[PDB]
């Protein structure tokens, strides 16, 4: 049924007050003010606070749409990082506030669980380069684990210290920068001078995935 | 005499101010949360800051205070140390990196940029010495550096924080440090860096040896 449209409006709508207020400020009433549905609709979907919370958590991962498999495993994953990046430089909701719900200091034991889904953003990397890592793509004695943190964490350090400093309009370059040092310790000399790190292939997967 | 005692209570206002900013970050920190912990009296915190601004931006900049054979042991030296401190819960490197990450007031009165800007800064000169010892890869910009540094630092903290509560801190800041090192300097450099948790425990054993918990001077008691 095409009303769980209507589904995907409520969190948008949800994500764009936790962006701009924080979970503790930010009130249902707000939300249904904000997405303009009705208490019913609401409710139908989620039943707290707290759930809409949790759902704007996994955006991060879950608002990226995906992305198609390429000639080498790590390029995927740099045009996943990238497409990540393009979004939040586009001041996409959803990826907005999931980044403020992340690493926004909360009120303490607010009962919010943030963990389960940076887990699930770091598993889903760590399984690309399981897939990098069997076709060769990787130099020996990597811990894939350890990597996959590295990645996730690269792209946050990133992306907070570029809206620090320029307010996010340095954005692209950074996340970049970070990715590809990062890439220079990871891959095989042969794949490394082949991955695409490009503005131009950026857009032009964002183009293709927005559809 | 009066100056060593001024530099002193000095310090207990900004570690004092740290721990407030740590609970409850930036808005909800308030000059007399701080006058009531450190028991100092106004007068004397009007005399050392002119806001709570500049003493949030003291606070930020306070690890900038505190020879190698090579600068980028330097480098590594000082942001171990930052995982060690923090991994420890000191107040000082605690307060920073909460008022580092907190989104914005705006509408807030902080100016953050100004104070990271001089780790940028510091980061900046480390690699510049660095590079007129030759240690450097050929033709880095140095400041983009400098920031990955500092992203990098920033990023597997946070993580660390919410995936293990900072268990594994030290392990993240040193792995993410290590590849981003690996990408930046020559590598008959590179093998004589030191990463071990050996090095960085001696490093902060030696801090902690001048890291005494700062108490104001007698003069500057609320009465």
Redesign the interface.
């Given at each position: 049924e095409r009303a769980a449209q209507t589904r995907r409006t409520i969190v948008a709508a949800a994500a764009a007050v936790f962006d701009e207020l924080?979970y503790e400020a930010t009130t249902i009433a707000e939300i249904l003010k904000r997405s303009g549905v009705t208490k019913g609709a609401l409710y139908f979907h989620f039943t707290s606070k707290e759930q809409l919370a949790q759902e704007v958590l996994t955006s991060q991962l879950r608002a990226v749409p995906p992305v198609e498999e390429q000639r080498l495993v790590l390029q995927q994953i740099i045009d996943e990082t990238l497409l990540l990046a393009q979004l939040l430089s586009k001041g996409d909701p959803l990826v907005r506030g999931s980044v403020?719900l992340?690493?926004?200091?909360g009120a303490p034991a607010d009962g919010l669980d943030?963990?389960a889904p940076?887990?699930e953003w770091?598993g889903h990397g760590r399984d690309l380069l399981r897939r990098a890592e069997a076709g060769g793509e990787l130099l020996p004695r990597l811990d894939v684990d350890?990597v996959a943190?590295?990645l996730?964490?690269?792209?946050?350090?990133?992306?907070?210290?570029?809206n620090?400093?320029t307010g996010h309009a340095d954005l692209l370059?950074?996340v970049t920068?970070?990715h590809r040092?990062?890439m220079?310790?990871?891959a095989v000399p042969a794949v490394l001078v082949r991955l695409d790190f490009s503005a131009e292939r950026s857009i032009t997967v964002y183009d293709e995935a927005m559809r």
């Open positions: 924080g403020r992340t690493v926004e200091p943030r963990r940076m887990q770091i350890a943190r590295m996730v964490g690269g792209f946050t350090g990133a992306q907070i210290l570029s620090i400093l370059e950074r920068d970070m040092h990062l220079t310790s990871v």
